[PDB]
Structures are given as structure tokens and as C-alpha cells.
Design an enzyme around this catalytic site. Sequence first.
Site, PDB file in Angstrom:
ATOM      1  N   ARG B 188      68.987  16.603  51.355  1.00 22.54           N
ATOM      2  CA  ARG B 188      67.605  16.247  51.677  1.00 22.54           C
ATOM      3  C   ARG B 188      67.590  15.265  52.836  1.00 22.54           C
ATOM      4  O   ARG B 188      68.417  14.355  52.902  1.00 22.54           O
ATOM      5  CB  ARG B 188      66.836  15.606  50.477  1.00 22.54           C
ATOM      6  CG  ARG B 188      66.906  16.422  49.182  1.00 22.54           C
ATOM      7  CD  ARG B 188      65.809  16.079  48.117  1.00 22.54           C
ATOM      8  NE  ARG B 188      66.233  16.581  46.798  1.00 22.54           N
ATOM      9  CZ  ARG B 188      66.008  15.972  45.632  1.00 22.54           C
ATOM     10  NH1 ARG B 188      65.336  14.815  45.599  1.00 22.54           N
ATOM     11  NH2 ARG B 188      66.480  16.517  44.499  1.00 22.54           N
ATOM     12  N   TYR B 221      58.773  21.466  55.081  1.00 22.28           N
ATOM     13  CA  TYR B 221      57.325  21.332  55.179  1.00 22.28           C
ATOM     14  C   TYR B 221      57.033  19.969  55.757  1.00 22.28           C
ATOM     15  O   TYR B 221      57.907  19.099  55.794  1.00 22.28           O
ATOM     16  CB  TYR B 221      56.657  21.478  53.813  1.00 22.28           C
ATOM     17  CG  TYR B 221      57.275  20.583  52.784  1.00 22.28           C
ATOM     18  CD1 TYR B 221      57.053  19.217  52.790  1.00 22.28           C
ATOM     19  CD2 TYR B 221      58.093  21.104  51.799  1.00 22.28           C
ATOM     20  CE1 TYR B 221      57.637  18.392  51.832  1.00 22.28           C
ATOM     21  CE2 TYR B 221      58.675  20.286  50.835  1.00 22.28           C
ATOM     22  CZ  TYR B 221      58.446  18.938  50.861  1.00 22.28           C
ATOM     23  OH  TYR B 221      59.034  18.138  49.907  1.00 22.28           O
TER      24      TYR B 221
HETATM   25  C1  LIG Z   1      63.241  17.747  44.154  1.00 17.13           C
HETATM   26  C2  LIG Z   1      62.169  18.076  43.146  1.00 17.13           C
HETATM   27  C3  LIG Z   1      60.877  18.378  43.589  1.00 17.13           C
HETATM   28  C4  LIG Z   1      59.865  18.691  42.681  1.00 17.13           C
HETATM   29  N1  LIG Z   1      58.597  19.008  43.157  1.00 17.13           N
HETATM   30  C5  LIG Z   1      57.666  19.303  42.271  1.00 17.13           C
HETATM   31  C6  LIG Z   1      56.332  19.635  42.753  1.00 17.13           C
HETATM   32  O1  LIG Z   1      55.934  19.661  43.916  1.00 17.13           O
HETATM   33  N2  LIG Z   1      55.457  19.946  41.750  1.00 17.13           N
HETATM   34  C7  LIG Z   1      55.742  19.966  40.402  1.00 17.13           C
HETATM   35  O2  LIG Z   1      54.848  20.276  39.617  1.00 17.13           O
HETATM   36  N3  LIG Z   1      56.987  19.641  39.968  1.00 17.13           N
HETATM   37  C8  LIG Z   1      57.882  19.334  40.848  1.00 17.13           C
HETATM   38  N4  LIG Z   1      59.150  19.060  40.407  1.00 17.13           N
HETATM   39  C9  LIG Z   1      59.381  18.957  38.966  1.00 17.13           C
HETATM   40  C10 LIG Z   1      58.963  17.550  38.461  1.00 17.13           C
HETATM   41  O3  LIG Z   1      59.499  16.507  39.283  1.00 17.13           O
HETATM   42  C11 LIG Z   1      59.433  17.311  37.021  1.00 17.13           C
HETATM   43  O4  LIG Z   1      59.228  18.512  36.282  1.00 17.13           O
HETATM   44  C12 LIG Z   1      58.654  16.157  36.392  1.00 17.13           C
HETATM   45  O5  LIG Z   1      58.870  14.928  37.088  1.00 17.13           O
HETATM   46  C13 LIG Z   1      58.925  15.922  34.921  1.00 17.13           C
HETATM   47  O6  LIG Z   1      58.196  14.750  34.504  1.00 17.13           O
HETATM   48  P1  LIG Z   1      58.557  14.001  33.172  1.00 17.13           P
HETATM   49  O7  LIG Z   1      57.505  12.879  33.098  1.00 17.13           O
HETATM   50  O8  LIG Z   1      58.669  15.058  32.108  1.00 17.13           O
HETATM   51  O9  LIG Z   1      59.996  13.349  33.419  1.00 17.13           O
HETATM   52  P2  LIG Z   1      60.517  12.261  34.447  1.00 17.13           P
HETATM   53  O10 LIG Z   1      59.571  12.256  35.646  1.00 17.13           O
HETATM   54  O11 LIG Z   1      61.947  12.510  34.701  1.00 17.13           O
HETATM   55  O12 LIG Z   1      60.201  10.929  33.740  1.00 17.13           O
HETATM   56  C14 LIG Z   1      60.773  10.601  32.452  1.00 17.13           C
HETATM   57  C15 LIG Z   1      60.605   9.107  32.280  1.00 17.13           C
HETATM   58  O13 LIG Z   1      61.204   8.687  31.030  1.00 17.13           O
HETATM   59  C16 LIG Z   1      61.963   7.525  31.256  1.00 17.13           C
HETATM   60  N5  LIG Z   1      63.025   7.443  30.258  1.00 17.13           N
HETATM   61  C17 LIG Z   1      64.213   8.127  30.223  1.00 17.13           C
HETATM   62  N6  LIG Z   1      64.967   7.826  29.190  1.00 17.13           N
HETATM   63  C18 LIG Z   1      64.233   6.865  28.511  1.00 17.13           C
HETATM   64  C19 LIG Z   1      64.474   6.137  27.333  1.00 17.13           C
HETATM   65  N7  LIG Z   1      65.576   6.247  26.595  1.00 17.13           N
HETATM   66  N8  LIG Z   1      63.534   5.259  26.936  1.00 17.13           N
HETATM   67  C20 LIG Z   1      62.423   5.126  27.664  1.00 17.13           C
HETATM   68  N9  LIG Z   1      62.092   5.756  28.788  1.00 17.13           N
HETATM   69  C21 LIG Z   1      63.039   6.617  29.161  1.00 17.13           C
HETATM   70  C22 LIG Z   1      62.471   7.641  32.688  1.00 17.13           C
HETATM   71  O14 LIG Z   1      62.695   6.319  33.141  1.00 17.13           O
HETATM   72  C23 LIG Z   1      61.264   8.282  33.387  1.00 17.13           C
HETATM   73  O15 LIG Z   1      60.431   7.269  33.936  1.00 17.13           O
HETATM   74  C24 LIG Z   1      60.162  18.690  41.309  1.00 17.13           C
HETATM   75  C25 LIG Z   1      61.441  18.382  40.861  1.00 17.13           C
HETATM   76  C26 LIG Z   1      62.450  18.087  41.767  1.00 17.13           C
HETATM   77  C27 LIG Z   1      63.818  17.753  41.239  1.00 17.13           C
END
Ligand SMILES: Cc1cc2nc3c(=O)[nH]c(=O)nc-3n(C[C@H](O)[C@H](O)[C@H](O)COP(=O)(O)OP(=O)(O)OC[C@H]3O[C@@H](n4cnc5c(N)ncnc54)[C@H](O)[C@@H]3O)c2cc1C
Lengths: 428, 427
Positions: B188, B221
Site C-alpha cells: 500500500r 483510486y
Molecule cells: C484494507 C481494507 C479495506 C477495507 N475497505 C472496506 C470498505 O471500503 N468498506 C467496507 O465496508 N469494508 C471494508 N473493509 C472491511 C472492514 O475494514 C472490516 O470488515 C471492519 O473494520 C470490521 O469491523 P469490526 O468493528 O467488526 O472490527 P475491527 O474494526 O477490527 O474492530 C474490532 C475492535 O475490537 C477491539 N478489540 C479486539 N480485541 C479486543 C479485546 N480483547 N477486548 C476489547 N476490545 C478488543 C479492537 O481494538 C478494535 O477496535 C476493508 C478491510 C481492509 C482490510
Amino acid sequence: QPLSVGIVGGGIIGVILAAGLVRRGIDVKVFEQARGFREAGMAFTANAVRCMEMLDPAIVWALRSSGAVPQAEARDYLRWVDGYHESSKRLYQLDAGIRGFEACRRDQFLEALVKVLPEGIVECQKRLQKIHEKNETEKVTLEFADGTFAHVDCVIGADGIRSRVRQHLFGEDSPYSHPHYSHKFAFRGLITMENAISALGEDKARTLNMHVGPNAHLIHYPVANETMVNIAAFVSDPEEWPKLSLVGPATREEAMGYFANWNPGLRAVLGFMPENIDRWAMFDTYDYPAPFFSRGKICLVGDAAHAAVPHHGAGACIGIEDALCATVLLAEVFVSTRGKSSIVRNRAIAAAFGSFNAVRRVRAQWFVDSSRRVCDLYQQPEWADPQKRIKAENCFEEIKDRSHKIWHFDYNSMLQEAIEKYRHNMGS
Amino acid sequence: QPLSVGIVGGGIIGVILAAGLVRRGIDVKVFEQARGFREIGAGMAFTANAVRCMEMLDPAIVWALRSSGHQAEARDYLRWVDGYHESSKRLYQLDAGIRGFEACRRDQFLEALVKVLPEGIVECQKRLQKIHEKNETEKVTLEFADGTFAHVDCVIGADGIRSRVRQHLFGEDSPYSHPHYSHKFAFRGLITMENAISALGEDKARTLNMHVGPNAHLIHYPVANETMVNIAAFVSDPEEWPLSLVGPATREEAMGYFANWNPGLRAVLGFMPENIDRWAMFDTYDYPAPFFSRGKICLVGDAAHAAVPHHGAGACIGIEDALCATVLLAEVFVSTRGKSSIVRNRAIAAAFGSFNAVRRVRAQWFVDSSRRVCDLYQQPEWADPQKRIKAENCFEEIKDRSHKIWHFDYNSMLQEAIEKYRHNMGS
Ligand SMILES: Cc1cc2nc3c(=O)[nH]c(=O)nc-3n(C[C@H](O)[C@H](O)[C@H](O)COP(=O)(O)OP(=O)(O)OC[C@H]3O[C@@H](n4cnc5c(N)ncnc54)[C@H](O)[C@@H]3O)c2cc1C
Ligand SMILES: Cc1cc2nc3c(=O)[nH]c(=O)nc-3n(C[C@H](O)[C@H](O)[C@H](O)COP(=O)(O)OP(=O)(O)OC[C@H]3O[C@@H](n4cnc5c(N)ncnc54)[C@H](O)[C@@H]3O)c2cc1C
Ligand SMILES: Cc1cc(O)c(C)c(O)c1C=O
Ligand SMILES: Cc1cc(O)c(C)c(O)c1C=O
Ligand SMILES: Cc1cc(O)c(C)c(O)c1C=O
Ligand SMILES: [Cl-]
Ligand SMILES: [Cl-]
């Protein structure tokens, strides 16, 4: 800047409309003529409650925190009973499903709603007297009776059955500016659940029932957690209604005279009422329905647009749909014109209010007529003659059709159609 | 008589789920291990479907999104381009429509979201160590690494791809409890829109294109208001991932994987800063969840179905989960007023059961479909010029798969969800 919306009228629909608008970033003011009052009860279909949720889920929360607290789960049923003959046979029944209707006290719900809103959205003792429009690009000016003024990008009349905003559109001397009498009025009042049970039986006493018969009908349902039963008794009135006020004092013995031939259980319910009760005249927009709900940057909603007699019990559901259609339309204005000039932004308002009218008027005005039509069927003179019983009972298919057309409204389609019409009206 | 939900993870999903619950009157606590924000300056985009789902959770979520990023209204197109051969001929295109996608800066969106919530919903420096489940009618106890505890009627794991609530469900030694390598990784970096044009043309440089080819593919993009273009180049890795999932890399390391590719693309790589980033790509494909919930514990978002990013929609799938779980818990809240402790806790588990039934298939389909479309972007056949006919029929599959993501009937999901909850209850 943002978009400012002046909502005239702090009733159910104005405040719901407001809540939906602020939750989306739109600058809102609600101008209400009364002095922080709510001076009764009302019911929402499950469809309308899903519309509320789409406006702001806290609205549904407000609804359920205002009401009461109810092993399996009860389905909601409209029921009709023969009111004229002692037969008192159950004629018909309509199943509305689990939480098919949800109920509140009007005044407690409004209070909760306003608590949900940001502070200083609702301005009380602000009675609208005049509207001053100008160019599409200038703010609309509202003039109040205490000499004050407001300036807003657009105006919504949620000011009820006697809407001032409506008078501005059609003219104070136009019959289209006023409601008129349905030649029916209701007696209302309460009785003890025990008394209720004494006259009707535990089963009828604890459910909602419409009692049908000639030229009148009566409805009743339990309230305040099945301790009291509310009575509304509707009768015919070949006379015009005098500026006499729509609500007024009356006596149980007056109501009992209209039901003198009816069956004994029903005449009892009446006799168990307080000696003193209310007489409410039923006005509506049936005779002179609005030719348009919107012009320029002014839009009517709720009873201001389509006030109805209350015999589907859903009039405020039609207004909640209005609120959702107007909220979603004006949200699309906000986002689609964000960087554009004052001209596009004001044209988009007008284009949105044009779409509103196009998508809402037919259903709203159908509903006003429907509300009278079903009253007629509950009051068929042939409920009197037992040899015309098949004819009179044949009405229920149509009641069912009309009920389901209200309850099963496709509001996602309405919103789609509305967005599409907005974009068309913008040249897109 | 109020219902408390413990969300582990203050990510986009955990916070959006919180916003949905609190607006409906539910007591929510969000437990985030981090001290503040991360993913600084990253962007992400949401399908219009996902934005309507957000609006249903709380319209204020959508306001937040839009304050975090004449002529007519623009349409949003995915574009593919041949990245291998000298011809670099446009290969396919897909219309997502007006506001088919909406984009934002993640950290600014998350921060705007936290302002929308009441105060004290989110507790930082709270890293879940261990979950203690007693009886269905008792509360679940959450133990954090700082030695404090917390007691909640139910628990939602929104703690991401390395979910600690997942490890609890399946066992910290199960492979089902951990994501694994997809044998691809990514480079990236940014370049200047100036340089982006000179290598691709103004046309390509100012929009989103994916350049396909053998065993690798590139996507770019624009960003910072069309002053810079963002590059992600994905390449195949036969080996296992040892080591840390992010690492520094060099421009030249990336150019090496794209030696035979056409010159416009090579030039783009050429224009990156000397130093850039390498990201391993893990997911839940190899060992997918046997179930998203058990008892009073439920997984949402990446915790449940972390996917490689080649559909670009993994947050959207997660927002769907949050919508379902919010609507379900609200139905528990209202359907159980005045019932006993016993019944309310059976209601929670019944609702989590319905969550599992309704979501698990679409979500694990999406994990698979993400690797799948990556495989189509990287067909070895793109190079072989006698198989450029079979190669290019992939795009009917990209289109159907994209549409299955984008035209999700979420009202039917809620309906089915409520009916399966009622069924589970004895109703
Ligand atoms: C490069 C990339 C680009 C992407 N672009 C897009 C896009 O344009 N659109 C889209 O819809 N999706 C996109 N995705 C997918 C998206 O980023 C993820 O699916 C999404 O962030 C998931 O969110 P989440 O809140 O489930 O998990 P996460 O965002 O990973 O957050 C989980 C949270 O839990 C916390 N946590 C972890 N373990 C613990 C613990 N034991 N105790 C307390 N807290 C904890 C972490 O600190 C974190 O803050 C992309 C993914 C990648 C890798
Ligand atoms: C007896 C009865 C029972 C009903 N039962 C049901 C039911 O079960 N279910 C259902 O869905 N509907 C029911 N309805 C319908 C419901 O009452 C109305 O349809 C609903 O209140 C319409 O919403 P509104 O807020 O537009 O009207 P209103 O509540 O009348 O709101 C108008 C508001 O505008 C204010 N206002 C008026 N003029 C001015 C002015 N010049 N300046 C500023 N403010 C002004 C008024 O003070 C008031 O606050 C019932 C109606 C009646 C009469
Ligand atoms: C739901 C309902 C409430 C009500 O107050 C009245 C008068 C009704 O006729 C109905 C339904 O028909
Ligand atoms: C057009 C549209 C816009 C919107 O913001 C919401 C809430 C909707 O469900 C629809 C449906 O068509
Ligand atoms: C904002 C945005 C994000 C995105 O992922 C795609 C594919 C787009 O076409 C646009 C805008 O056009
Ligand atoms: Cl009504
Ligand atoms: Cl993704």
C-alpha cells in the site's frame, strides 16, 4: 449552511416530523399556538410504528414508555357485535397480528417526544397569523399573533384540522380552507371495568368491540390496565353544527335516548357512565379536499392536509407516513444540493414538495372518504330489520379490504417513488 | 427493568451496534482495548444498501458518515482494466448508480459516531481477558486485563478478526478460533495525482480501477480530494506467514512482483515513496465459524466472518449483522416487559439463535466469495493469450456476486429474524 424548516403546529405529526428532521441534521423549529399544554387516547398500526422507527427509533421508545405494561403473546383483533338485537351475536373479527396496534395517551406521548428532541426546538404561544412568500430563493416569513416573526427556508403546516397554513394556500373565504361537518357526533366517557363486565360479560368487556346498528354505533375498549373501559358512542345529526365549539358538555341521559331501542347490555354501558360527559362534533376534509398538499416551499401534513373522521382509528397513521415521506425527501435535498448555490437548493425544496404532493395525495384523500364510508356501514339502517341481515352483514368484506389497504401500506415503495419523482422534477 | 448488553470491541461495528441499541432504550457498554483511535487517515466505503441499514439503526449514524467525507448527479462505477499486456484495454464496468457507494475517513467517522452516543457508553483500555458464563438466568461476567470486571445480561463479540470472544466460544486452541493466511499479501502506498495521470491518463487516474493479471492484481483510486491516488497491489505468496502481519517494505520489492506487467502500471508502482507497507491478508475461510452465537454470547462483524477485502464490502456485511441484532434485541425488550427473569433470559438466547440462523449463510458465503473474486482477478489465464476468452467470462460472476452483496433484501432478513425468534420462543 444547513436547511431550516419551520413546522407550524406542535401536535403529534409536527413533533414526529421534527424529530425525524433533526436526527438527520436539518435545522427545525416547531411553532405551537397553545401554552405548553396538551389540554384523550390514540392508536398506531404496526406499519405506522415501523414508519416511526425509520424516522427515529427513539420515537417508538417514547411511544412504549408512555403507555402501560401489558404467558403467550396476544394478537390484536378488531371485533364487531350486533348492537340492536339482544342476539348480540359476534358478527365479524379482523386479526391484526402481534402488536398489530400499539397504544399510548396522546398527552404522555407528546411530552415524551419533546423530551427526546433537543432543547429549544418547540416554541409555544406562537400562533401563526400570516405567511409572507416571495421568490423561491428568499426565506419564507412567518408572522405570529404576538407580533413576532420567523424566517425559514421552507414551511410545513402540521397545524391540524383548522390549519392556518391551509387557509393561506386556498384563501380564507374558500371552502377548501376549512373543515366541514360529517353530520355525526360522539358521546365519550368511562365506566368501571366491573360495571363494564356487569353489562357485557368479561370477554366483551376486556376487548375492543364495535356495536353496529341503525344510524349510530358504539365502540369501547379497556384502558388504564383493564380497570376502566372507554366508551365512544356515535350518532347522526341531520342539523348543521352552529362557531359553537366542536367539544361541549353533555349528559348520559342524552346519549341514552339515541340508543333507546338498542339491546340491553349496550343501554347498560351507557347508564353506567358519569352523569356528565362530552359531545364531540366530527369534522373532516371530505367535502372539500385539498387540490394540492403543496405549493412552492409550503407543504401540508397530517390533519392539516387530510383530517378525517376517526372511524378507521388510523388518521394519525396517515400523518406518520406523511412525516416519513417529507423527512426522506428533505434529507435527499440536503445531501444532493449540499455544495450547490442558493438557487438549486431552493428549487430542490420545491421539487421535493412537488414530489410529496404527487405521492401522498391520492392515498390520503382516499382515506378521508374511506373513514366516512366505513362509518356508513357500521350504521346501516338495515341493521334494524332482521330480514335484511344478509345484506347488512355483507359489508364486512369491504371493511376488510379497506382495513388491509391501510395496514399493509408499502412505504418503501412510496419512498422510492418519491425520490424518483424528486429527481425527475429537478430535470434529472 | 432494563436490558444490558456488553459489546466487546469499539470498532465500526461495535459502535454502530451500540448506537442502534441505545436509541431503542437498551443499556449498552462498549469495552475497547485501545486507548484511543487507530487506522488514522484510512478511508472506507459503504454500499447504498449498507447506508440504508445504518439509517434504520439510527439516522444520526448517516449524518455522521456524511460529515466525515452545478452539473448533474454523479454515478459510481467499478472498473476493471488489463494490467498485464501492452494494450491495457478497459475490460468491464459495473454501474452502482447515484450514491451507490459513500466514502469516509474511518477514524473521523468513528469519532463522529462516539459524539452521537451518550457519554460513558465507551470504556477504553478495557481488554477482554476471559468470559465467565454461569446460568442462563444469571449475568455473564466479563474479566478485563486490568483486573476489573463487568456484569451484563448478554455479550456481543465485535472485537475483530482476532476476536477474543470467538476464542471463548470455540476454545483458545481450536483453529476455528483464529483466522488464517489466504496466501496473498498487499503493498500500500500513495502517489501524487500528477504522477498518477502521467502513467495512466487523466481518465484512469481520477477513478477506481482494478488491474487484473496473473497471480496478482492492483487497484487504485483517488484521495485527499483528488490530489493523491492510493495504491494497493496484491501478490501471491506460496509460503506461510511466520512474524507480524504488518511490516515495512520497499517500492522495489513491489515492482519485482509486477516485472512483466504493462508499463503504465509499472510506472505507478515506480512513483511510490521509497518506503511503503506490506499487509498480510487473513480471514475465516479455512476454519469458518460453526455458529455465530451460543447461549447469551453472539459474534458480529469480523469477529464472526472476517473476510479478505476484494469485494470491498466487509463492513457492510457487518452493518447488516448489527441491524439484525439490534432489531432482535429490541423485540426481546418489548416482547418480554413484565415477564420474569427466567423468561427474559430465554428470550435473549432465543434471539441469538435466530441471529445465527438468519445471518450465518450469507456471511460465510461472503468470506468465500471474497477469495473467489480475488482468484478471478488473478487467473493465471490473464497472461496466456489463447485463454483470454475463458478468462474474461469471469465478469458475469463478478456481477452476480456483486449484486448479491449490493441488493440485499434486508427487510426480509428482519422479518425472517422476528419469525424465527417467535418460533424459538414457543410462539
Ligand atoms: C484494507 C481494507 C479495506 C477495507 N475497505 C472496506 C470498505 O471500503 N468498506 C467496507 O465496508 N469494508 C471494508 N473493509 C472491511 C472492514 O475494514 C472490516 O470488515 C471492519 O473494520 C470490521 O469491523 P469490526 O468493528 O467488526 O472490527 P475491527 O474494526 O477490527 O474492530 C474490532 C475492535 O475490537 C477491539 N478489540 C479486539 N480485541 C479486543 C479485546 N480483547 N477486548 C476489547 N476490545 C478488543 C479492537 O481494538 C478494535 O477496535 C476493508 C478491510 C481492509 C482490510
Ligand atoms: C377521538 C379521536 C380518536 C382518534 N384515534 C386515533 C387512533 O386510535 N389512531 C390514530 O392513528 N389516529 C387517531 N386519531 C387521529 C389523530 O387524533 C389525528 O389524526 C392526529 O392528531 C393528527 O395529527 P396532527 O398532529 O396533524 O393534529 P393535531 O394533534 O390536531 O395537531 C395540530 C397542532 O397544531 C397547533 N396549531 C393549530 N393552529 C396553530 C397555529 N395557527 N399556530 C401554531 N400552532 C397551531 C395545535 O395547537 C396543535 O398542537 C383520532 C382522532 C380523534 C379526534
Ligand atoms: C383502532 C381503532 C381505534 C379507535 O379509537 C376507533 C374509534 C376505531 O374505530 C378503531 C378501529 O376501527
Ligand atoms: C428510497 C429510500 C430512501 C431511504 O432513505 C430509505 C429509508 C428507504 O428505505 C428508501 C426505500 O426505497
Ligand atoms: C465514494 C466512492 C467509493 C467507492 O468505493 C466507489 C467504487 C465509488 O465509485 C465512489 C464514488 O464514485
Ligand atoms: Cl382517525
Ligand atoms: Cl472487505
